[PDB]
Ligand SMILES: CC1=C(S[C@@H]2CN[C@H](C(=O)N(C)C)C2)C(C(=O)O)=N[C@H]1[C@H](C(=O)O)[C@@H](C)O
């Protein structure tokens with residue numbers, strides 16, 4: 329079901345949802361996949377996560393313009409690392425309104441990211457304060473607590489069985505939790521379980537670094553995280 333477009337791969341998940349995949353090329357690293365989402369919300373398109381680079385992100389915009397040809401109303405990025413926020417300048421050059429966790433915007437300069445134009449804040453139960461996420465349509469944004477990073481956020485897509493874990497969630501066969509340099513090893517497992525609880529009807533779990541998985545992804549991530557906590 330994957331389709332190549334330039335150096336990107338797109339996979340349709342639902343009538344109005346596609347996963348975008350881009351691959352990092354510095355000289356020094358493998359071709360590392362990163363996934364995000366494209367959501368058609370009627371007469372506009374919503375983007376979750378940039379690609380690694382501005383150029384790659386501009387390719388995503390060209391795919392959208394060709395294959396959907398509606399205006400991109402907004403992008404939300406799920407934390408301040410390159411694979412999620414590397415393409416902010418391309419979004420801004422295209423005049424797209426960008427949203428991130430307030431904490432992601434505060435971290436951005438230290439991480440080398442361009443901050444999003446707008447800051448999301450969250451209630452104590454983890455749900456985005458809806459004043460800070462105006463006209464998000466089907467995107468249900470949830471901060472599950474610190475895990476992969478302090479600022480990681482997650483997104484459910486209303487009307488579908490899809491929830492997006494970002495880099496918080498790893499696939500049910502993953503051997504490790506990936507990059508833990510910025511991780512909160514005490515709270516990670518609870519944050520993975522909270523994501524599962526926030527979207528209890530989602531049966532397709534989309535994540536940054538593997539194909540869409542079942543809910544087993546969530547329970548396998550929380551286990552690896554608790555193993556890490558107890559060492
Ligand atoms: C580096 C990237 C990683 S670690 C990585 C992805 N899966 C890898 C792997 O070794 N597999 C065997 C699948 C290595 C992750 C991550 O594990 O979540 N994401 C990026 C970095 C990150 O998100 O922390 C970039 C954004 O700095």
Ligand SMILES: [Zn+2]
Nearest residue numbers: 407409476495
């Ligand atoms: Zn990350």
Ligand SMILES: [Zn+2]
Nearest residue numbers: 411495536537
């Ligand atoms: Zn990642």
